[PDB]
Design a protein around this ligand. Sequence first.
Ligand SMILES: O=c1ccn([C@H]2C[C@H](O)[C@@H](COP(=O)(O)NP(=O)(O)OP(=O)(O)O)O2)c(=O)[nH]1
Ligand SMILES: [Mn+2]
Ligand SMILES: [Mn+2]
Ligand SMILES: [Mn+2]
Ligand SMILES: [Mn+2]
Ligand SMILES: [Mn+2]
Ligand SMILES: [Mn+2]
Ligand SMILES: [Mn+2]
Length: 901
Amino acid sequence: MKEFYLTVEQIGDSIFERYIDSNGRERTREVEYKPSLFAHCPESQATKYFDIYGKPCTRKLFANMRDASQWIKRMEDIGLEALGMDDFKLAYLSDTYNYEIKYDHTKIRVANFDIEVTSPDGFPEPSQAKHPIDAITHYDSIDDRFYVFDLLNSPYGNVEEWSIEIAAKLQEQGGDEVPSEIIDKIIYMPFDNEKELLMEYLNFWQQKTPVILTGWNVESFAIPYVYNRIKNIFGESTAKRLSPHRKTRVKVIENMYGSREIITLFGISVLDYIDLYKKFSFTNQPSYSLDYISEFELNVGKLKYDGPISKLRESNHQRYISYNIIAVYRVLQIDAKRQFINLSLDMGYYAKIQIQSVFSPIKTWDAIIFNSLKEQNKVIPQGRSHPVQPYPGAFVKEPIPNRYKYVMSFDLTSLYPSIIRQVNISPETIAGTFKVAPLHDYINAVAERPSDVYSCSPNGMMYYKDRDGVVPTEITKVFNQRKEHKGYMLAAQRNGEIIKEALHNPNLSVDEPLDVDYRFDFSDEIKEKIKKLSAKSLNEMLFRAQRTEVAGMTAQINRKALINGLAGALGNVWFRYYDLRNATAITTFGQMALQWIERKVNEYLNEVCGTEGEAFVLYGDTDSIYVSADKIIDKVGESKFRDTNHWVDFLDKFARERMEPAIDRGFREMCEYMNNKQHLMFMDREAIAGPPLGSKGIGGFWTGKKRYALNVWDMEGTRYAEPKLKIMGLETQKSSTPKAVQKALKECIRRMLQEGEESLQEYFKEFEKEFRQLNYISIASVSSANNIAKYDVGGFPGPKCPFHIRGILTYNRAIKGNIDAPQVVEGEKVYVLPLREGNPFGDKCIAWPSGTEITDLIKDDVLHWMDYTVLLEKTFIKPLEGFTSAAKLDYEKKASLFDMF
DNA sequence: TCAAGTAAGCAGTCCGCG
DNA sequence: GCGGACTGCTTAC
Ligand SMILES: O=c1ccn([C@H]2C[C@H](O)[C@@H](COP(=O)(O)NP(=O)(O)OP(=O)(O)O)O2)c(=O)[nH]1
Ligand SMILES: [Mn+2]
Ligand SMILES: [Mn+2]
Ligand SMILES: [Mn+2]
Ligand SMILES: [Mn+2]
Ligand SMILES: [Mn+2]
Ligand SMILES: [Mn+2]
Ligand SMILES: [Mn+2]
């Protein structure tokens, strides 16, 4: 096969590379790499090398990397540009792998581990590692085995060996329920002493040295803890055996209060799964314990036990070891669903970067663009310094707050990059400028046409129409990948609705799920075979379809994030191709397109409805329009459809047949106007929304910008079995809203939209009567905790102290002295509850870390003092008043000028 | 040169107010 | 007790 790399590092004048050779074997090599950089020279020069502007360049071949750096610095001291790729590991990979890399993931050792450390005296600080490591479980993807290192004797208790037969039993039969499909994959190794355990771990690590290293929080706890514990017992140089080149960086910062640590292990690409999840998952969780996310992602149950984890090894070593194995497996399960490692690998190899660089869009694109330029024998510009300048972004229309019964929506496909391709925006396609009118004049087609010769944006920029840009070119490739995957995703989603519907009519037999690809729309024969399957079969198919759709989501939305990352990068001073002219060319064009198309859609709709000067477009954000369909529905009545699906079918046809072509005509005109290279403003229909036919529902409402709810029947061609609420911005969407209040406001909204005022009130009365019976954690607010120290001391609230930060201080005073209480962590999220006046805490609110019950120390007298009246009003009534005042309903009634028996 | 962007809502603090 | 200027956080895009 063709070779590919695993890791690369720069060590002085040395590149260290781990790689897979042409035979499939893992190898390592040290290369004294000779880098090249370039300098402009006179046009009188025989040279194949030009920079991206067409200026001639001469190559300088250096004997080592140190020299290249030295030269770069003299060039600055002289004031002349030093061109070329200055991140030498990137250039090396580009020289070494001059082809599209087809990697083979079964040869990439992916490791996943979790450690346990008993700690009677508070959270075990990694920067100190003063406690024994009493368990490690380490899964190796190539062995497909879980290696378990278990400490039987430690100064914190002697325990006997762990039992694999008891691990397997149902929890109800006294077992730990280690899932059956991994029981056979476990390899168990007890140890009399910590030293022999760590020694043996290090020996294992050498034989099976991770390429990709993951886990939950491994970056902040496991890795630094292991590194520092090995250091303390054996010395640093032994601790350095964790790096395949024996080099590490610490790192630092710290800082207070009181200390944290991050180790860098050269020759390993660490991808902490919690980071992969934050970047790639597009959720905002109230908490990031493995148990919360596992439950969220997998629908598995909380990992139950009695007593604090500081006594768990002692009271029940058996469960302790089993829960350690399970945590590792759980991260394996989250990844089989989300597929973030596979994505990281796709992106990393595509860009030709270090796999951990996928966290960096700027770095990812620097390498993609660099590689694309080096193929044409071109020379990248030097990275310059720039001051940080704010600049204008998208347009958002101000909506009239109201209920809106029937609404269709339309949204532009991949807007920013589409713009980049339509206008042909690139550092090296800049043609000149033109004198700019106010933006309203373009939108209204009254300003003079910018140019006859160049592609333009209403920010005043002009671009060459003939030559293609490195940016448009490379941004198209990734776009095309996103398109593909989105299709798989949507198809799996439609396939999902078809299965759901068939679940209304099983159908009693004994069968197997059909063998099919959920990435493509079910054929008619397949649809036939399905209408005759059992509930078992069909449920297995729904699961499979929903997993194919999740995979499609991951692959498509993150490819979109990448491309959008490029547009935003142009506005980041650390980006080699930073340039506000390009950044604003994109954004300003986007504001124009949205407002232009608003005008056009109003013009077309007034026409066909024969009416005049009426607003059909009710809202719009960046690249979307929301269209009232009341008068399109009314033009016909009402009657006059048989059921909901009928009018949905109507509007669908009307969008596809009448509106779609006028929109396209509208944007075709806009393209001509700006004389663009290619027409790519494609605005597909999104939601079709309204109340169930016959009901008293309102269908939808806006309260303001970025705050609306819609009852949707069809979404971008997916006709839903049951109506699905599209809620944007409302408290139901905010991670800081208590879980139970989220659910309650959602149900209030479901009612308003589907059933009307009377149903709303009915439910609101019930929730008020029952509020106080809820679990305290389900009605607690949530907040991130930044810049905490600032608002001490000592330790009481200082001036301007935020409410949640106040709660942490109240917590910090409550737990002063008890070495057992779990500590709030700077930058982490916290639960927050208000307290009644006269509480023994001495203030109006308390806060503890999230995803955790509050410590039994103070728990009992927090419950006693929680202020329900304030909670309900703050988190539930205020926001509800918002919704209903906007949609002109009341949640209570209402003094009716009656009343009477 | 370790480093995608802007727009904009709401909850809270501090101050004003016979 | 309510509205205006500010911080802090959080979504929508
Ligand atoms: O995180 C984002 C999201 C969107 N945007 C910009 C770019 C995007 O093209 C534009 C429109 O927002 P959408 O949510 O519609 N995404 P896009 O149009 O790219 O993709 P699509 O509509 O095809 O899903 O807003 C960002 O700059 N950053
Ligand atoms: Mn024994
Ligand atoms: Mn059970
Ligand atoms: Mn654990
Ligand atoms: Mn969309
Ligand atoms: Mn869009
Ligand atoms: Mn779309
Ligand atoms: Mn959009």
